[PDB]
């Protein structure tokens, strides 16, 4: 804290309590006792543990019937209208699309559908897998997921 | 009816103004005005002026007939006391409080 080290008064004589720095934590406008720092809240996960949790959550999506696996899933031109129409014929509201190879057409079509996240099988992550109701996965995506989890 | 009149931030202590206000309580406004007229307190000057104000408000905004009036409610509340400083001996500084009060009189047609 911006201050000085002058004892605000003597050690004795006065009627006031002891004090030795205006930057004491006790005082108003003093210094935080255990002042926080920029830390790193990163945790470690054993690669086996990550893969195991992800295989388990894929098993659970399959069991709860939330993984809608399909063949190639695409829009022809970048229109969020076209994409929402596709998902409106597919009876979907909150979806994570995972294609084995992503085209900027569908990516730009799903960029502005906040209830729709398009990804690539290389960049799947459990928080998305659970936060999204219906996870639609192209067949090539499923093959990549297989050959990566294994 | 009940016509109100307030002197807010009255330059005097409530301890004194209410000391004088405890005279004219429930007394008909005539004898109240007279008691205050011959009561020898700055607070008496103050409460008398506020009572005149109440009577005028009653007989201009809310009707008439001074005679049919009583001082039912009168109370004196503390106001924001000014924190001055008064230097005493040996570099020790006091805090003289330029107090004040919130006088309020309510005249009633009963």
């Amino acid at each position: 804290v911006t201050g000085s080290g002058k004892k605000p008064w003597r050690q004795k004589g006065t009627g006031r309590a002891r004090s030795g720095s205006i930057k004491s934590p006790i005082w108003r406008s003093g210094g935080v006792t255990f002042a926080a720092r920029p830390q790193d809240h990163s945790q470690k996960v054993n690669k086996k543990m990550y893969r195991g949790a992800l295989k388990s959550i894929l098993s659970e999506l399959v069991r709860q019937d939330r993984l809608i696996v399909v063949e190639k899933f695409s829009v022809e031109a970048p229109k969020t209208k076209l994409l929402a129409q596709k998902l409106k014929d597919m009876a979907l509201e909150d979806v994570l699309i995972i294609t084995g190879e992503l085209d900027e057409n569908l990516f730009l079509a799903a960029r502005n559908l906040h209830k729709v996240d398009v990804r690539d099988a290389t960049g799947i992550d459990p928080v998305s897998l659970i936060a999204f109701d219906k996870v639609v996965m192209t067949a090539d995506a499923v093959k990549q997921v297989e050959e990566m989890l294994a | 009816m009940e016509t109100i009149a307030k002197h807010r931030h009255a330059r005097s202590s409530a301890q004194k103004v209410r000391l004088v206000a405890d005279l004219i309580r429930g007394k008909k406004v005539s004898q109240a005005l007279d008691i205050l007229t011959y009561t020898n307190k700055k607070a008496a000057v103050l409460v008398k002026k506020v009572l005149e104000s109440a009577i005028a408000n009653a007989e201009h905004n809310d009707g008439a007939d001074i005679d049919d009036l009583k001082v039912t409610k009168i109370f004196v509340d503390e106001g924001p006391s000014m924190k001055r400083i008064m230097p005493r001996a040996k570099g020790r500084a006091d805090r003289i409080l330029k107090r004040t009060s919130h006088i309020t009189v309510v005249v009633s047609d009963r």
Binding site: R10, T14 | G91, R92
Partner: peptide, 14 residues
């Protein structure tokens, strides 16, 4: 009060 008057000496109870 930045000035703090010293206390008067205590009775010499020696």
């Amino acid at each position: 009060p930045v000035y703090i008057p010293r206390p008067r000496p205590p009775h010499p109870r020696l």
